[PDB]
Design a protein around this motif. Structure first.
Motif, PDB file in Angstrom:
ATOM      1  N   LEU A   8      -4.101   1.012  -6.117  1.00 25.62           N
ATOM      2  CA  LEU A   8      -3.057   1.942  -5.810  1.00 25.62           C
ATOM      3  C   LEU A   8      -1.809   1.174  -6.162  1.00 25.62           C
ATOM      4  CD1 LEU A   8      -4.800   3.445  -2.889  1.00 25.62           C
ATOM      5  CD2 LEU A   8      -3.765   4.761  -4.284  1.00 25.62           C
ATOM      6  N   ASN A   9      -0.821   1.690  -7.066  1.00 26.81           N
ATOM      7  CA  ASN A   9       0.292   0.929  -7.109  1.00 26.81           C
ATOM      8  C   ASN A   9       0.149  -0.300  -7.800  1.00 26.81           C
ATOM      9  OD1 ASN A   9       2.063   3.230  -6.074  1.00 26.81           O
ATOM     10  ND2 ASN A   9       1.813   2.247  -4.212  1.00 26.81           N
ATOM     11  N   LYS A  10      -0.912  -0.230  -8.701  1.00 30.82           N
ATOM     12  CA  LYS A  10      -1.113  -1.588  -9.306  1.00 30.82           C
ATOM     13  C   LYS A  10      -1.681  -2.610  -8.577  1.00 30.82           C
ATOM     14  CE  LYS A  10      -0.309   0.824 -13.316  1.00 30.82           C
ATOM     15  NZ  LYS A  10      -1.192   1.330 -14.062  1.00 30.82           N
ATOM     16  N   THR A  11      -2.395  -2.537  -7.315  1.00 30.89           N
ATOM     17  CA  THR A  11      -2.776  -3.487  -6.717  1.00 30.89           C
ATOM     18  C   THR A  11      -3.989  -2.901  -5.905  1.00 30.89           C
ATOM     19  OG1 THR A  11      -2.223  -5.349  -5.499  1.00 30.89           O
ATOM     20  CG2 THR A  11      -1.556  -3.438  -4.400  1.00 30.89           C
ATOM     21  N   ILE A  12      -4.847  -3.737  -5.703  1.00 30.08           N
ATOM     22  CA  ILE A  12      -6.082  -3.597  -4.761  1.00 30.08           C
ATOM     23  C   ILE A  12      -5.645  -3.318  -3.397  1.00 30.08           C
ATOM     24  CG2 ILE A  12      -8.436  -4.295  -3.856  1.00 30.08           C
ATOM     25  CD1 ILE A  12      -8.552  -3.211  -6.653  1.00 30.08           C
ATOM     26  N   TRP A  13      -6.057  -1.861  -2.856  1.00 29.75           N
ATOM     27  CA  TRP A  13      -5.736  -1.639  -1.285  1.00 29.75           C
ATOM     28  C   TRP A  13      -7.422  -1.576  -0.740  1.00 29.75           C
ATOM     29  CZ3 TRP A  13      -1.916   1.786   1.542  1.00 29.75           C
ATOM     30  CH2 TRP A  13      -0.815   1.504   0.905  1.00 29.75           C
ATOM     31  N   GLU A  14      -7.675  -2.107   0.388  1.00 28.38           N
ATOM     32  CA  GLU A  14      -8.991  -2.127   0.967  1.00 28.38           C
ATOM     33  C   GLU A  14      -8.661  -1.606   2.349  1.00 28.38           C
ATOM     34  OE1 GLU A  14     -10.873  -6.360   0.526  1.00 28.38           O
ATOM     35  OE2 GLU A  14     -12.687  -5.515   1.062  1.00 28.38           O
ATOM     36  N   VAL A  15      -9.369  -0.580   2.428  1.00 28.79           N
ATOM     37  CA  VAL A  15      -9.133   0.243   3.594  1.00 28.79           C
ATOM     38  C   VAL A  15     -10.471   0.711   4.299  1.00 28.79           C
ATOM     39  CG1 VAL A  15      -6.968   1.019   2.613  1.00 28.79           C
ATOM     40  CG2 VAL A  15      -8.811   2.543   2.791  1.00 28.79           C
ATOM     41  N   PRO A  16     -10.517   0.974   5.692  1.00 26.77           N
ATOM     42  CA  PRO A  16     -11.682   1.571   5.960  1.00 26.77           C
ATOM     43  C   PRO A  16     -11.965   3.086   5.630  1.00 26.77           C
ATOM     44  CG  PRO A  16     -10.335   0.709   7.860  1.00 26.77           C
ATOM     45  CD  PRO A  16      -9.520   0.749   6.537  1.00 26.77           C
ATOM     46  N   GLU A  17     -13.251   3.049   5.590  1.00 25.69           N
ATOM     47  CA  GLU A  17     -14.071   4.343   5.186  1.00 25.69           C
ATOM     48  C   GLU A  17     -13.364   5.629   5.972  1.00 25.69           C
ATOM     49  OE1 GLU A  17     -18.101   5.216   4.816  1.00 25.69           O
ATOM     50  OE2 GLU A  17     -18.253   3.448   3.205  1.00 25.69           O
ATOM     51  N   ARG A  18     -12.799   5.540   7.036  1.00 24.66           N
ATOM     52  CA  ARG A  18     -12.304   6.378   7.905  1.00 24.66           C
ATOM     53  C   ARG A  18     -11.018   7.039   7.212  1.00 24.66           C
ATOM     54  NH1 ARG A  18      -9.369   4.864  13.610  1.00 24.66           N
ATOM     55  NH2 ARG A  18      -8.171   7.056  13.774  1.00 24.66           N
ATOM     56  N   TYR A  19     -10.358   6.267   6.544  1.00 21.85           N
ATOM     57  CA  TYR A  19      -9.204   6.881   5.584  1.00 21.85           C
ATOM     58  C   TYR A  19      -9.603   7.366   4.179  1.00 21.85           C
ATOM     59  CZ  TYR A  19      -6.873   4.927   9.887  1.00 21.85           C
ATOM     60  OH  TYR A  19      -6.588   4.802  11.101  1.00 21.85           O
ATOM     61  N   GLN A  20      -9.408   8.480   3.780  1.00 19.95           N
ATOM     62  CA  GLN A  20      -9.580   8.785   2.605  1.00 19.95           C
ATOM     63  C   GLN A  20      -8.719   9.659   1.755  1.00 19.95           C
ATOM     64  OE1 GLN A  20     -12.701   8.784   1.085  1.00 19.95           O
ATOM     65  NE2 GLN A  20     -13.647   7.394   2.689  1.00 19.95           N
ATOM     66  N   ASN A  21      -8.686   9.759   0.327  1.00 23.62           N
ATOM     67  CA  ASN A  21      -7.851  10.307  -0.465  1.00 23.62           C
ATOM     68  C   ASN A  21      -6.541   9.774  -0.404  1.00 23.62           C
ATOM     69  OD1 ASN A  21      -7.356  12.527  -2.507  1.00 23.62           O
ATOM     70  ND2 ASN A  21      -6.494  13.775  -0.686  1.00 23.62           N
ATOM     71  N   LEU A  22      -6.576   8.665  -0.574  1.00 27.38           N
ATOM     72  CA  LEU A  22      -5.051   7.843  -0.322  1.00 27.38           C
ATOM     73  C   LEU A  22      -4.467   8.422  -1.929  1.00 27.38           C
ATOM     74  CD1 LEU A  22      -6.830   6.189   1.685  1.00 27.38           C
ATOM     75  CD2 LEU A  22      -4.977   4.139   1.062  1.00 27.38           C
TER      76      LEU A  22
END
Ligand SMILES: Nc1nccc(-c2c(-c3ccc(F)cc3)ncn2C2CCNCC2)n1
Ligand SMILES: O=C(Nc1cccc(N2C(=O)C=CC2=O)c1)c1ccco1
Ligand SMILES: [Ca+2]
Ligand SMILES: [Ca+2]
Ligand SMILES: [Ca+2]
Length: 344
Positions: A8-22
């Motif tokens: 996202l925005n040209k960089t890797i985001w690493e997020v818990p599965e709890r948060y979706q549809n970023l």
């Protein structure tokens, strides 16, 4: 929790599965923001990924400052925290910080741009800013750069102050004492900004659209009048004082002749906010009692903040000390209840 990766925005985001549809919704102070769906609660949230939070001693202390501040802020008109997370499994792996708050769709510029606001609506918007400021000021936190783009607003015109207590920025809303680097100032720097915002909501145009700091000062003095010698007391630079003293004297304008057609109560409040003498400027708590907000004012629902310990601000620590303190604050975070409010 299982984490996943998404560019996202040209960089890797690493997020818990709890948060979706970023999906990206713009930059914030020292980070970038995505809207997301919180599958635990069905609520929409905004997730800010801090940019290079430990790249330098400046970034590291700024990261700690922001996390401490946001963990303390518990007010309906101030951005606070639903969650804070890191993909790191230990302090040794710790290099990324994500902050979660309730999703707000827009900023104040989205509200006033294509809409002639009613006076009742302007009252509500300014009332909320002032309610949030009363809270932050009570914890000895000042915004210092309050402006429409630092007011998050949702689709029902509910508003929250953000980026307080912390690229070419607008200076059109900055208090004169901030913009011109005067030696001392108080919490009412933010009240000047409220006056500038409120004026624009009533007229549909910027109050002081200066092209530079000197042009902006001239526009300000044209409205509020030449100040007395006592105000020069606040200005260190002799060149700056000599210049201001040299200006042709201007009378203060009667605001009733400026904000033609406005609610006389709005005009009166503006006169109390847009004064150069910051010791004579109305405070947030006083403004909330002004008759302009009579239909909204409720002393039972204008709370102050718990005491906020800012002693860390005077300390120089090593990057890894700020990093470890930040990690401690991440791990100790307690999510608020989903419903923290009750009928009055
Ligand atoms: N859409 C939205 N909703 C709520 C907040 C923000 C937000 C945050 C932010 C701060 C702390 C946090 F924990 C999560 C997000 N920082 C800047 N923004 C802005 C993104 C673009 N301008 C409007 C708000 N954006
Ligand atoms: O002239 C303008 N606005 C203005 C100026 C002065 C006054 C009021 N006013 C109030 O203050 C309240 C209602 C109203 O029209 C509005 C303008 C906006 C965009 C282009 O020109
Ligand atoms: Ca109420
Ligand atoms: Ca009550
Ligand atoms: Ca409830």
């Amino acid at each position: 929790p299982t984490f996943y990766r998404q560019e996202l925005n040209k960089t890797i985001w690493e997020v818990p599965e709890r948060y979706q549809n970023l999906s990206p919704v713009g930059s914030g102070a020292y980070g970038s923001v995505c809207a997301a769906f919180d599958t635990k609660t069905g609520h929409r949230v905004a997730v800010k990924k801090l940019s290079r939070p430990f790249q330098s001693i400046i970034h590291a202390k700024r990261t700690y400052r922001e996390l401490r501040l946001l963990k303390h802020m518990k007010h309906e008109n101030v951005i606070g925290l639903l969650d804070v997370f890191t993909p790191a499994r230990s302090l040794e792996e710790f290099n990324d910080v994500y902050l979660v708050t309730h999703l707000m769709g827009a900023d104040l510029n989205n509200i006033v741009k294509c809409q002639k606001l009613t006076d009742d609506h302007v009252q509500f918007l300014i009332y909320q800013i002032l309610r949030g400021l009363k809270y932050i000021h009570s914890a000895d936190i000042i915004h210092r750069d309050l402006k429409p783009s630092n007011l998050a607003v949702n689709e029902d015109s509910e508003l929250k102050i953000l980026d307080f207590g912390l690229y070419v920025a607008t200076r059109w809303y900055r208090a004169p004492e901030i913009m011109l680097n005067w030696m001392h100032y108080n919490q009412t720097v933010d009240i000047w900004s409220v006056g500038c915002i409120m004026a624009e909501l009533l007229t549909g145009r910027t109050l002081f659209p200066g092209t530079d700091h000197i042009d902006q000062l001239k526009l300000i003095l044209r409205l509020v009048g030449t100040p007395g010698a006592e105000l020069l007391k606040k200005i260190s630079s002799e060149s700056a004082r000599n210049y201001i003293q040299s200006l042709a004297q201007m009378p203060k304008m009667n605001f009733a002749n400026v904000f033609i057609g406005a609610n006389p109560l709005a005009v009166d409040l503006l006169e109390k906010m847009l004064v150069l003498d910051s010791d004579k400027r109305i405070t947030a708590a006083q403004a909330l009692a002004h008759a302009y907000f009579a239909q909204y004012h409720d002393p039972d629902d204008e709370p102050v903040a718990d005491p906020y310990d800012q002693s860390f601000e005077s300390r120089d620590l090593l990057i890894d000390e700020w990093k470890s303190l930040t990690y401690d604050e991440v791990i100790s975070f307690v999510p608020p209840p989903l419903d923290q409010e009750e009928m009055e």
